[PDB]
């Protein structure tokens, strides 16, 4: 069900944002922006992890986030069109 996928993406977003903020020390706004940019796999590289923990964290975010986000946008696609 699409709504459940949405909930998974929301959980991923919180995880991404909190982690970047507390591991890398960026603001909450930058961290959320980075989370979206990373999980949509856009990844501008204006922000990126600079510590070894941040890098490991980024890899797990990638593993949890990218699949979940892809299915969310295409389920949203189906629903609105």
SS (H, E, C) the chain: CHHHHHHHHHHHHHHHHHHHHHHHCCCHHHHHHHHHHHHCCCCCCCCCCCCHHHHHHHHHHHHHHHHHHHHHHHHHHHHHC
Residue 66 lies near Ba ion (rule: CB under 5 A)? no
Q: Does the footprint of Ba ion cover residue 43 (CB under 5 A)?
A: yes
Asked whether position 40 contacts its own copies by CB under 8 A, the answer is yes
Shortest Å distance, C-beta 25 to its own copies:
16
Please give the structure tokens belonging to residue 15.
Answer: 């995880």
Compute the distance between CA of residue 35 and CA of residue 43 in angstroms, rounded to an integer: 9
| Contact pick of 16, 17, 20, 49 for its own copies (by CB under 8 A) | 49
Does position 6 interact with its own copies (CB under 8 A)? The reply is no
Chain residues in the site for its own copies (CB under 8 A): 4-5, 8, 29-30, 32-33, 36-38, 40-46, 48-49, 52, 55-56, 58-59, 62-63, 66-68, 70-71, 73-74, 76-77, 81
């Amino acid at each position: 069900p699409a709504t459940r996928i949405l909930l998974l993406v929301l959980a991923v977003i919180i995880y991404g944002t909190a982690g970047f903020h507390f591991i890398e020390g960026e603001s909450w706004t930058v961290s959320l922006y980075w989370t979206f940019v990373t999980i949509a796999t856009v990844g501008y590289g204006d922000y990126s992890p600079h510590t070894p923990l941040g890098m490991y964290f980024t890899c797990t975010l990638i593993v949890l986030g990218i699949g979940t986000f892809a299915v969310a946008v295409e389920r949203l696609l189906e629903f609105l069109i």
